[model samples]
Target chain A: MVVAGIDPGITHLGLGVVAVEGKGALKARLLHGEVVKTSPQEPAKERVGRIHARVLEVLHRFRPEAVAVEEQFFYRQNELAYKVGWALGAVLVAAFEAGVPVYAYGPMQVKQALAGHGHAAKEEVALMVRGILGLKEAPRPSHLADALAIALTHAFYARMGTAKPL
Target chain B: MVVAGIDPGITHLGLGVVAVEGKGALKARLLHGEVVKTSPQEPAKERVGRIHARVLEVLHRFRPEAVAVEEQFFYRQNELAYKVGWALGAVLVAAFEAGVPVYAYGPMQVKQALAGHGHAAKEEVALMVRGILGLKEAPRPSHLADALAIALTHAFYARMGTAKPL
Candidate 1:
């Protein structure tokens, strides 16, 4: 089964895809994960369009069966929330446009699923993510690993029916 | 000639379009203003798509010869600024795609056009705008009038027969 997860942001959106196999003792392997960024020099409204196009292109290329997304935490400014909300629009539209089913998980749920602790340090989550994926090398830049962690979180909890609301 | 002026925000974008005669005088008024809202329940990325589509639709319907935009002020939150930067991108792309020349004016310049003072208070600017637009009644909501104030400001500055910058 192919699974993709997104750690969403306005400037940089992190995405990870994994393929799962093996029936009794299931193992998931990372296929690809990366970040998409927008520069501030570009105007705000244009970025929304550009991001929408780019994210849809990604969905077309990756074509994952299930998509897991992180919910927004909180932004200080009303404008910030609005812009971030714009980015999220692209993500959802792409999923709907591509006929992909999407699931949402909060930040805390992702952390606990990856690190076995709800209040896990970011580093610890990264380490556990690397271990679960059997990665030989450290994932450069933490966001990539965090994206994969979100993917793994869905697999560990949702896929196996282990997660219960706390 | 038709001209439109836009004041961009994360949740609400104020737009005003009016017909201009040979010398940039307001002839026929089309629309005052409104918001392009991203649902608060929606993610930030998705809101961007909503903003982009709404902006483009407005531009297409208005078919303005020119679009004057109010340059953003320095925002307190860096993330908020970045988000606004993203929204500006969508606005520019849509206008450029429609072959409309986009002109930008600073907040100070806009205020000076409306109130003859660069640092005039908001109430003062609103009052001046009411007078210039020759509104029979007090402007509806303060924000709608404020949108008209920005549109009038841009039209006045554009008619000044002075170059914007060196």
Candidate 2:
């Protein structure tokens, strides 16, 4: 089974792909990158549409069987929560239209699933992800490492649960 | 004390003023009804700026001590949510700059506070709002009633400790 995990952002959308082999053994890799954004002169709606279309484009390019995103879990700033919700809705709609199974994991769950510590530090997370992927050094930009961690978290959830929708 | 509630839309912006008297006695009255829209070819950000400017114009005219908005909470086939959010951000910034305390209430919360049920139909809410305000009929186009309901909800939340910083 091939699954991809994504961390959506305004300026940069982080993505990681993993190839899940037979039980207990995995050949997974992390890639670092971003999608192109619209120029400033474009209308806000047009730009939002551009981002939505481009994200779907990436999904088509990767053609992953399943897609996963981290559920937003912040409430300190309600307005920011609102914006993240809007973005998540866009991403979810795209994935749904693409006929890809989408799931959401929390930050702590992602960390515990990948590194055994829910409160793991940045460097520790990078090292643990690298170790999991059997790499010599950490993936660039840290976002890529986080993406890989999220992918592994989804894999764990799949193995543990027969229930599908998230 | 005086407070203003605004229901902002791309084409039309509704403003309501509520006078706070003794002990939960707030009288919401219509203060302004003006359309704020840009040409179809006008730049989208500029159109947002137009909404912001017109909203601030109403704010200045009414001189309300606080402002409340029924937070954007609808989803249609059209992804107008982003446009509404941007327009809302503009309104929030205006209030913040003017030092008018701001509050945002969910549409359902407003309706529930006024109509007594979370799932109250829109017509029911409009009728209740008209009855409470002692008006001959419900306000037209619905945004007017919505704006008044937002003010009433803000007052309730302010008293009940769920007040948002708009």
Candidate 3:
């Protein structure tokens, strides 16, 4: 099965798709991933349209069976958090419109699954994600790395037959 | 010209459409307004799709030339704020896709334009909105009333030929 994981944002939406094979000894490998970038100078309303279109493009190309996304995390600025939420909404709508089941993982849950601890630092989580994906170099820019980690974490949980609420 | 105003939310997205005629001493009245409700029990991912579809339905039916939406406001909980942001994204995307110019109004701006005070109470704003729209009864539920107020506020500003950053 193929699963796509997304770390959504207004400026950069990270997307990672992984293909998993086997049951007892499951193998998960990255099929494709990237950080979709947008500019802060762009109008907020126009940005939503661009983000929705880009996400839809990725979903169409990957055609994953399931999609995993990072749930809302606390941000110092309320306005920043709200902008991220809008970006996430577009991602979710695109995935669902494409007929794929969606899953949500908390930042802590993703860290614990990949870094062996809930309170792991961003660097640690990124390093662990790199090792798990067997990438030649670490995923540049934390957003893309986090996206891969989310996908891998979901794959691990799915293989273990664990179901978590969305 | 026709303008659509939206009070965006995950559970209930209030939409109001108004038609304004003539420039000086502008005359504006409600074309249609309602709160589009989505169940909380529905999956968060599915809710975006539903909201997008409903907003598109309204836009197609009304064919408004412009869309005015409430911008991000500070919320106590980051999660709640994020949900509202997502709803806003879907609304913006729908308007942009329909070729309508989009405008954003801050809560304060909407209140001041409708009630002549930024700190106006909900009851006062609702009453003022009803009076301005010349409605027989106040729009049911505060969301719809707020939406009409937002649309009216936009029309008021547009007639005065002022631009505010979104």
Candidate 4:
């Protein structure tokens, strides 16, 4: 199954497509990893429109069965969190408008699903993602790493009772 | 100019259309007011989709020159803020998609614009809104009142130097 992961933000919206093959204890492969960049100079309305269009375009291009987004855990700056929430909202709206399911995973859940521990550091989670996808290194930028991890979460959650050997 | 105010939410998205006429110190009228509600039992994706669709529909129906939304000020619960942000994002996207500009005002701005003071109580704000619109009484449900207050913010901001007597 192919799933898309979105690390929604205003500056750099991270997107990743992951294809997991083999039903039980599946092997994960990174199909696509990219970022949607927007500048602050643009009007907020226009920026949001760009995000809405981009997410829908990705859904059309990759045709992922579902889209996974991270539920923001905590933010040092509540103001920044509010802005990210807006971007996340637009992302999910387009996802659902395209007839794709959107599943939200908490930050810890994604870290745990990818790194075997909820409290795993960001570096270890990224490293684990690289190993899972057999990459020379983890995806570029922390946002991209998180996008892939979010996608992998769906793959892992599919087989709940089965032992995940990977 | 005609403006639409959106108090976005999942359960009940308050929407109000206001028409301001006669340039500076103009008269304001409530053209339309309604709520778009979604069931909690519905899937999250569907709920977001419904919000997206309804907002677009309203824009197309009323053809407002702009949309006004409140920048959430303070919330006792952070989770509620996140959900409202999602709805607000979707609302603004639709507004921009329809080629209408979106304006956001802090909660205090709305209160000050409508009631002459930023710290005015909700009751006074509603009373002021009713008087400004020449309505028999304020719109039902606090959400609807807030929707109109937000729209008024746009009209008030338009005339930066004018003395608003009404």
Candidate 5:
């Protein structure tokens, strides 16, 4: 099964596509991963439209069966959160339009699923993702690494039969 | 000029269409105003799609040149805010798709624009909206009243030559 994971944001929306081929104790392979960039200085509506269109393009390219998104856990600034929420909104609409079911994983859940600990640091999670996907180096710009972790988390949850709906 | 106001939500999206036929010190009249209801228990994707479709319907019905939406001021809960943001995303996409310019106003701006006081109570705002629209009764369910207030605020701003782009 192929699954997609997204770390939604306005500046750099991270995307990861993972294909799991084996049965129980499945082997996950990285099919595709990248960040969809948008300008922060643009009008909010235009930025949102661009993100929506880009997500649709990615979905069409990958054709994943399921999509995973990181559920925002903290809110430092209401304004920034609102903007990011709009970005996530665009991502959700694109996924729905593409006929893929979405599942949301919290930050800690993703950390635990990827690094064997709920309180794992970013470096630890990145290293684990690199090893899991047999990557020679960690994904760049941090957002891509986060997206891989999100997709890996979903893969783990699916294998454990404990995945929750967003 | 005709303006459409949206009080966006996942369950009950309120919309108001007000027509201003004259120029300076504009005369405002209610073209149409009502709530579009959706089941909260439905999937997020379905709710968003329904909202997009309904906003398009309203735009087609009224053919408003400008659209105004209330910007979320406070973030009480992240999950609820995220869902509301998704609903706003749908409304915005509909407006953009129909070639209508979209504007966003803060909660205080809408309140003050309608009632003269920034901290006016909900009842006060509703009564003012009823009078402004020449309605015999206050619009029902409260959301409609809020939507009308948003529309009226945009009209006031446009007439005063102070309307800002979103």
Candidate 6:
């Protein structure tokens, strides 16, 4: 099954599309990866619109079976969390409008799924993600890396029948 | 011109549509008002979609010239802010997709627009909103009341050329 993972933010939303192959051992490759960026100069309202439009287009173009993102309501900071929440709110609506089932994994859940432990940093998570996907270089910006990690995490969880759509 | 105001939240999203009539003095009336409630039992993904669908429908039906909501990043709570961010994202996407220009008003702006003071509580705001719109009874739930305040706030601001869509 194919899955898309999103690390949502207002200025730098990230998306990764991964297709899982093989029956038992499993093979995964990055079909798409990018940190969608918006300028701070733009109006906040249309900034959100652009994010939604881009995410929706990606979903329609890729047609993923499931969508996953970093866990909901688990952020550490207050202002940043609320701001990211704005981006996430847009992401969730895009996923649903595209008719894809959605999944969420906490920071630790994403880390554990990729690094075999819950304490890995972004570098650790990115390194593991690159190794798993067999990429030549690590994805740039923690946003895209985190997005791929969540996508791969969801792919594994879905194959194992573990995670549920939120 | 018509304006729609939204108080974004997960369970009790508020929406108020108002039409401003008359040329010189300006007269306004509430065309619609309600606090949209969604079941907490449902998945969060689809919950956002439902919110988007309803808001988009209201915008299309009413053809509001502008859309307004409470300020973007003035919330005090962390977890609650993040969750509400989810709803705001959906509402914003809905407004943009419907081609309605979006505006945001702070708590002070909404309150001052009606009650002539920034410190007015929700009850005072609600009372003023009802009086301004000529409603027989104050709107139930603070969510709906705040929404109407934002709408009227936008209406007044638009007439005075004071606010710009974000």
**Under CAPRI classification, how is model 2 graded?**
incorrect
State how far residue B30 of model 5 sits from its true place (Å).
2.2
lDDT of 2 at A57: 78
**Chain B, model 2, TM-score against the native?**
0.81
Taking all chains together, the TM-score of candidate 2 against the true structure is 0.51
Stretch of 10 with least lDDT, candidate 2 chain B: B74-83
Q: TM per model? A: 0.68, 0.51, 0.92, 0.90, 0.91, 0.91
Interface RMSD of 5: 1.9
Highest lDDT against the true fold, candidate: 6
How many Å off is the CA of A136 in candidate 1?
Answer: 2.9
The residue-by-residue lDDT of candidate 2 on B1-166, one tens digit each, is: 5677777654555667776555644445555554455454643435555665666676777788778877754443122454455455556545644557677777688767777788888777677667656679777656666777777677666767777764
Which rank order by TM-score, best down to worst?
A: 3, 5, 6, 4, 1, 2
- Residue-wise lDDT of candidate 3 within B54-89, one digit each (tens)? 888889999987788876677464877888988887
Can you write out model 4's per-residue Cα lDDT over A16-116, one digit (the tens) per residue? Answer: 99988875554688888888887878777777778888888888888988888876646354346656767877887787778777777877887778778
Q: RMSD, each candidate, Å?
A: 5.4, 13.0, 2.2, 3.9, 2.2, 2.3
Q: Compared with the real two-chain complex, what DockQ does model 3 have? A: 0.69
**DockQ comparison, 3 vs 4, better candidate:** 3
CAPRI level of candidate 1? incorrect
Per-residue lDDT over B60-104 for candidate 5, one digit per residue giving the tens place of the 0 to 100 score: 989998888887876364667777888887776677667788877
Worst 10 residues of 3 chain B by lDDT: B20-29
lDDT at A41, model 6: 82
Any runs in candidate 2 off by more than 4 Å, and if so which?
Answer: A30-42, A162-164, B1-166
Candidate 5 docking class: medium
Report the Cα lDDT for candidate 2: 0.63
Worst 10 residues of 6 chain A by lDDT: A71-80
Where does model 3 sit among the CAPRI classes?
Answer: medium
Error of 1 at B86 (Å): 8.5
Instruction: Find the candidate with the highest DockQ and give its number.
Output: 3
A1-166, model 3: which lDDT tens digit per residue?
Answer: 7888888787888888888776555356788878877786877767878878877887888898778888755655423778888788788778768877778898788877777788988678777777766677887667777788788788878777783546
DockQ, model 4, C-alpha based: 0.47
True contacts kept of each: 0.10, 0.01, 0.75, 0.54, 0.38, 0.83
TM-scores of chain A across the candidates, in order, are 0.85, 0.81, 0.86, 0.88, 0.90, 0.89
Q: List the residue pairs that clash in candidate 4.
A: none
